[PDB]
Design a protein around this motif. Structure first.
Motif, PDB file in Angstrom:
ATOM      1  N   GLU A  14      13.466   1.002   5.423  1.00 38.89           N
ATOM      2  CA  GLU A  14      14.727   1.372   6.058  1.00 38.89           C
ATOM      3  C   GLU A  14      14.570   2.452   7.126  1.00 38.89           C
ATOM      4  OE1 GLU A  14      14.926   3.291   1.825  1.00 38.89           O
ATOM      5  OE2 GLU A  14      14.185   1.429   2.724  1.00 38.89           O
ATOM      6  N   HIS A  15      13.427   3.130   7.140  1.00 38.81           N
ATOM      7  CA  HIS A  15      13.196   4.181   8.127  1.00 38.81           C
ATOM      8  C   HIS A  15      12.557   3.591   9.374  1.00 38.81           C
ATOM      9  CE1 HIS A  15      14.252   6.868   4.978  1.00 38.81           C
ATOM     10  NE2 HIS A  15      13.064   6.947   4.403  1.00 38.81           N
ATOM     11  N   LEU A  16      12.220   2.309   9.307  1.00 45.20           N
ATOM     12  CA  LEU A  16      11.524   1.639  10.401  1.00 45.20           C
ATOM     13  C   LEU A  16      12.294   1.588  11.738  1.00 45.20           C
ATOM     14  CD1 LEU A  16       8.873   0.709  10.958  1.00 45.20           C
ATOM     15  CD2 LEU A  16       9.310  -1.504   9.882  1.00 45.20           C
ATOM     16  N   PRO A  17      13.600   1.245  11.725  1.00 51.31           N
ATOM     17  CA  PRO A  17      14.255   1.217  13.041  1.00 51.31           C
ATOM     18  C   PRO A  17      14.535   2.621  13.561  1.00 51.31           C
ATOM     19  CG  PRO A  17      15.828   0.671  11.332  1.00 51.31           C
ATOM     20  CD  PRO A  17      14.488   0.739  10.661  1.00 51.31           C
ATOM     21  N   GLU A  44       1.058  10.275  16.422  1.00 55.77           N
ATOM     22  CA  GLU A  44       1.961  10.629  15.323  1.00 55.77           C
ATOM     23  C   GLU A  44       2.888   9.455  15.001  1.00 55.77           C
ATOM     24  OE1 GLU A  44       3.066  12.053  12.833  1.00 55.77           O
ATOM     25  OE2 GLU A  44       1.627  13.693  12.634  1.00 55.77           O
ATOM     26  N   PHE A  45       3.238   8.678  16.023  1.00 52.18           N
ATOM     27  CA  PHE A  45       4.047   7.479  15.817  1.00 52.18           C
ATOM     28  C   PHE A  45       3.336   6.487  14.890  1.00 52.18           C
ATOM     29  CE2 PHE A  45       4.960   3.090  17.435  1.00 52.18           C
ATOM     30  CZ  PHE A  45       6.181   2.946  16.807  1.00 52.18           C
ATOM     31  N   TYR A  46       2.065   6.217  15.182  1.00 48.57           N
ATOM     32  CA  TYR A  46       1.238   5.340  14.357  1.00 48.57           C
ATOM     33  C   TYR A  46       1.227   5.839  12.920  1.00 48.57           C
ATOM     34  CZ  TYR A  46      -0.604   4.011  18.976  1.00 48.57           C
ATOM     35  OH  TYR A  46      -0.749   3.614  20.284  1.00 48.57           O
ATOM     36  N   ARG A  47       1.074   7.153  12.776  1.00 45.34           N
ATOM     37  CA  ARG A  47       1.036   7.760  11.449  1.00 45.34           C
ATOM     38  C   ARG A  47       2.344   7.495  10.697  1.00 45.34           C
ATOM     39  NH1 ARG A  47      -1.408  12.816  13.741  1.00 45.34           N
ATOM     40  NH2 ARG A  47      -3.653  12.405  13.984  1.00 45.34           N
ATOM     41  N   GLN A  48       3.486   7.656  11.368  1.00 38.35           N
ATOM     42  CA  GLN A  48       4.759   7.507  10.661  1.00 38.35           C
ATOM     43  C   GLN A  48       5.043   6.046  10.327  1.00 38.35           C
ATOM     44  OE1 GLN A  48       7.809   8.903  13.265  1.00 38.35           O
ATOM     45  NE2 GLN A  48       6.957  10.967  13.514  1.00 38.35           N
ATOM     46  N   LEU A  49       4.543   5.144  11.171  1.00 40.27           N
ATOM     47  CA  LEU A  49       4.511   3.723  10.837  1.00 40.27           C
ATOM     48  C   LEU A  49       3.765   3.475   9.534  1.00 40.27           C
ATOM     49  CD1 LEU A  49       4.056   1.691  14.145  1.00 40.27           C
ATOM     50  CD2 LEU A  49       6.113   2.126  12.787  1.00 40.27           C
ATOM     51  N   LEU A  50       2.566   4.045   9.447  1.00 45.04           N
ATOM     52  CA  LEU A  50       1.736   3.886   8.258  1.00 45.04           C
ATOM     53  C   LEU A  50       2.430   4.412   7.001  1.00 45.04           C
ATOM     54  CD1 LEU A  50      -0.754   3.122   6.766  1.00 45.04           C
ATOM     55  CD2 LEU A  50      -1.902   5.170   7.639  1.00 45.04           C
ATOM     56  N   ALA A  51       3.011   5.604   7.101  1.00 46.45           N
ATOM     57  CA  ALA A  51       3.638   6.232   5.942  1.00 46.45           C
ATOM     58  C   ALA A  51       4.823   5.392   5.479  1.00 46.45           C
ATOM     59  CB  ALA A  51       4.077   7.650   6.267  1.00 46.45           C
ATOM     60  N   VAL A  52       5.630   4.954   6.444  1.00 45.39           N
ATOM     61  CA  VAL A  52       6.758   4.073   6.161  1.00 45.39           C
ATOM     62  C   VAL A  52       6.324   2.790   5.447  1.00 45.39           C
ATOM     63  CG1 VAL A  52       8.246   2.385   7.307  1.00 45.39           C
ATOM     64  CG2 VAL A  52       8.502   4.814   7.805  1.00 45.39           C
ATOM     65  N   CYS A  53       5.246   2.171   5.925  1.00 44.30           N
ATOM     66  CA  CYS A  53       4.761   0.938   5.307  1.00 44.30           C
ATOM     67  C   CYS A  53       4.305   1.194   3.874  1.00 44.30           C
ATOM     68  CB  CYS A  53       3.616   0.329   6.116  1.00 44.30           C
ATOM     69  SG  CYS A  53       2.997  -1.226   5.429  1.00 44.30           S
ATOM     70  N   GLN A  54       3.601   2.304   3.676  1.00 44.11           N
ATOM     71  CA  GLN A  54       3.036   2.641   2.373  1.00 44.11           C
ATOM     72  C   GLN A  54       4.128   2.949   1.357  1.00 44.11           C
ATOM     73  OE1 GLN A  54       0.537   5.717   4.242  1.00 44.11           O
ATOM     74  NE2 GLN A  54      -1.173   4.927   3.018  1.00 44.11           N
ATOM     75  N   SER A  55       5.215   3.545   1.835  1.00 46.54           N
ATOM     76  CA  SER A  55       6.267   4.016   0.945  1.00 46.54           C
ATOM     77  C   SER A  55       7.066   2.850   0.375  1.00 46.54           C
ATOM     78  CB  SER A  55       7.198   4.976   1.686  1.00 46.54           C
ATOM     79  OG  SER A  55       7.790   4.342   2.811  1.00 46.54           O
ATOM     80  N   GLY A  56       7.178   1.777   1.150  1.00 47.75           N
ATOM     81  CA  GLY A  56       8.006   0.649   0.765  1.00 47.75           C
ATOM     82  C   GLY A  56       9.409   0.859   1.293  1.00 47.75           C
TER      83      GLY A  56
END
Ligand SMILES: CCCCCCCC/C=C\CCCCCCCC(=O)SCCNC(=O)CCNC(=O)[C@H](O)C(C)(C)COP(=O)(O)OP(=O)(O)OC[C@H]1O[C@@H](n2cnc3c(N)ncnc32)[C@H](O)[C@@H]1OP(=O)(O)O
Ligand SMILES: CCCCCCCC/C=C\CCCCCCCC(=O)SCCNC(=O)CCNC(=O)[C@H](O)C(C)(C)COP(=O)(O)OP(=O)(O)OC[C@H]1O[C@@H](n2cnc3c(N)ncnc32)[C@H](O)[C@@H]1OP(=O)(O)O
Ligand SMILES: CCCCCCCC/C=C\CCCCCCCC(=O)SCCNC(=O)CCNC(=O)[C@H](O)C(C)(C)COP(=O)(O)OP(=O)(O)OC[C@H]1O[C@@H](n2cnc3c(N)ncnc32)[C@H](O)[C@@H]1OP(=O)(O)O
Ligand SMILES: CCCCCCCC/C=C\CCCCCCCC(=O)SCCNC(=O)CCNC(=O)[C@H](O)C(C)(C)COP(=O)(O)OP(=O)(O)OC[C@H]1O[C@@H](n2cnc3c(N)ncnc32)[C@H](O)[C@@H]1OP(=O)(O)O
Lengths: 265, 259
Positions: free
Chosen positions: B239-242, B224-236
């Motif tokens: 700021e949710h990264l840290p 699920e962590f990998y998934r949220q990384l992906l979604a964050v990257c896709q969204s642009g």
């Protein structure tokens, strides 16, 4: 001519034009796409051979070391600079990294060891003051309480011209304190890994800093940087730490770039 | 009893109870210290000596190695045993640090190399999906597009129990992909130094991760962590990264502590 070859293909290994594990150009070859003579090109292909980044010998010719897999033995070397050498992006990427992680271990340092952090930053400021405002390096060393150990780290016996050698010694001492600031604060994060990173790179740091801080403007900039680092730590507003470190990274970098176009060679 | 001794002495060469600068006390009041036969104290004192953190001798007071000045030797050498001696907080400090720098180089990766980074994470995610959802490691490897190359890195036969072999194989494989995630993203920051850091610790990584990912809940959490990384990257929305990475660090750190 050797230094130029040196730095060209070194930074060509880094930037992946001559990738890790590739066979490096046989040579007839490589002197046009370097564009210098080859008595000098392979005086430096053996220099380069192993200071630790190429392969040697007779029948199969020369490829570059590793892909890397894992031999962390001698990978920083030769080494570096200033940047009549490599630094390429290697030293500049290391510097970028220092800017990158500094807000981390310094936010830690300012929280867990406010104490010490202030004690260290104040120490460093005081020492740099006595350094840069002394009318001589010998004056500074005469009045410094820590003369002897400074002397066991700071030495210069390759420059005879006293005035030049002394300018160089002041530069070295200032680097000494820059390193003190970063290394001590890093060790005062509580996560030792940072401090260890600085200790493992201390040679590279020493040389590069000896060079960078020959610029008065660098020394000044750094001194003001140390200053509001202290102010931020005392104040508790650790929200301004990455601003301060970023702007420092920026201004220092611009100086780095100004020591580049300018001057000799 | 031996490992306990070894690690104690290691993990406070660590915190400076015998700081890098100390001469080590005589051995008997070390058996006053914390209670193992010292017939074998000297077996682990030399054990550490061999592995490179004490120096043994002539007549002496045996003191422990340099204190740092470099040799950076290969002081990974590797009483990162795995980290039963120890994760001290060496591995946990490495882990804390991983958590520390991850939002940075991942922010770089997602900014400069958005599509490539997304591609790497989609790869890792799909591979892991096919991993944990297969009815066996053998099935997974049978239908895997990257079988030969997985097999060139993931191997284990010091274990006889076929089914257990299948669980540890799954673990090693998931670790393989976790490493892929972090290492590839770091090399895609644009500053190679991060990637090199991961390459330099890849052995240690591989072990710690093999054991850590022997836990099913660890694997799930990671996915699920990998998934949220992906979604964050896709969204642009970089700021949710840290945030995201921090949460991972906490939950994983909790699991790491044995849960
Ligand atoms: C990418 C880079 C590549 C590298 C690899 C990175 C990847 C992975 C990273 C890593 C691998 C992981 C796996 C390996 C792990 C292995 C672990 C180990 O092996 S064990 C680790 C223990 N390490 C220690 O360092 C403990 C010891 N701690 C310390 O020494 C402290 O930090 C210390 C003392 C340095 C800071 O404490 P203070 O803040 O109180 O500083 P004060 O002691 O007051 O000053 C020291 C000296 O400086 C002089 N000094 C003070 N003020 C001065 C001044 N203003 N000017 C000049 N000199 C001054 C003093 O006179 C004093 O002298 P006088 O020490 O007695 O010789
Ligand atoms: C883990 C290993 C650690 C290694 C460190 C060990 C220490 C070094 C050891 C041995 C070397 C010897 C050194 C001896 C030192 C003594 C002598 C000196 O002091 S020489 C100093 C002279 N000054 C420089 O050299 C400048 C260094 N470079 C920098 O400081 C930065 O690169 C800087 C400030 C110049 C900016 O460069 P940008 O590329 O990082 O940032 P931009 O290109 O302007 O903006 C683009 C993106 O940057 C990202 N970014 C910036 N900071 C970020 C962060 N913290 N995390 C993630 N992304 C970040 C943002 O996403 C931003 O994109 P959006 O804002 O979204 O449009
Ligand atoms: C104490 C700790 C030590 C720390 C050290 C301190 C740090 C720094 C300190 C001081 C600095 C000193 C500096 C001196 C350093 C001396 C040397 C140098 O100067 S630098 C040399 C290294 N440089 C690089 O490695 C470039 C970056 N590396 C890469 O990019 C990788 O090689 C690469 C290309 C593999 C990853 O990048 P991709 O995104 O392009 O990935 P793809 O090209 O697709 O390769 C993937 C492989 O994995 C398979 N793969 C792909 N998908 C897969 C899947 N889903 N499952 C399994 N396998 C898959 C693929 O089929 C492929 O296999 P297939 O070998 O090519 O046949
Ligand atoms: C540059 C060097 C780079 C090296 C990189 C090496 C990479 C790896 C290589 C080789 C090692 C092998 C690795 C194998 C990996 C593969 C398998 C795995 O994935 S294993 C995953 C296991 N996970 C961990 O072990 C977690 C690591 N630790 C952490 O991530 C951090 O410690 C973390 C995130 C758990 C905590 O970080 P904090 O220190 O920032 O948090 P706090 O210190 O507790 O305090 C934060 C503030 O927020 C409040 N706070 C804390 N918790 C709170 C809460 N629940 N609610 C509200 N407030 C809270 C606190 O009161 C505190 O307040 P106030 O800032 O002091 O004022």
């Amino acid at each position: 001519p050797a230094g130029f070859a040196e730095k060209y293909i070194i930074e060509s290994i880094w930037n992946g034009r001559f990738p890790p594990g590739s066979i490096l150009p046989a040579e007839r070859e490589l002197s046009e796409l370097i564009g210098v003579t080859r008595t000098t090109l392979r005086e430096v292909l053996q220099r380069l051979a192993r200071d630790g980044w190429l392969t040697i010998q007779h029948g199969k010719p020369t490829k570059v070391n590793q892909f890397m897999e894992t031999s962390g033995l001698h990978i920083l070397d030769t080494l570096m600079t200033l940047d009549a050498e490599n630094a390429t992006s290697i030293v500049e990427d290391l510097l970028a990294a220092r800017t990158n992680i500094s807000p981390i271990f310094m936010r830690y340092a300012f929280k867990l060891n406010k104490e010490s952090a202030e004690r260290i930053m104040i120490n460093v400021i005081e020492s740099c003051e006595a350094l840069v405002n002394a009318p001589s390096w010998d004056a500074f060393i005469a009045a410094s309480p820590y003369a002897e150990k400074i002397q066991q780290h700071v030495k210069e016996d390759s420059e005879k011209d006293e005035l030049k050698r002394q300018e160089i010694l002041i530069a070295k001492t200032f680097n000494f304190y820059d390193y003190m600031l970063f290394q001590r604060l890093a060790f005062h994060s509580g996560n030792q890994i940072y401090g260890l990173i600085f200790n493992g790179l201390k040679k590279l740091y020493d040389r590069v800093g000896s060079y960078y801080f020959s610029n008065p403007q660098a020394r000044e900039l750094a001194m003001e940087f140390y200053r509001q680092l202290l102010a931020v730590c005392q104040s508790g507003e650790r929200e301004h730490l990455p601003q301060v470190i970023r702007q420092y990274g920026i201004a220092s970098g611009h100086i780095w770039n100004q020591m580049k176009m300018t001057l000799p060679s």
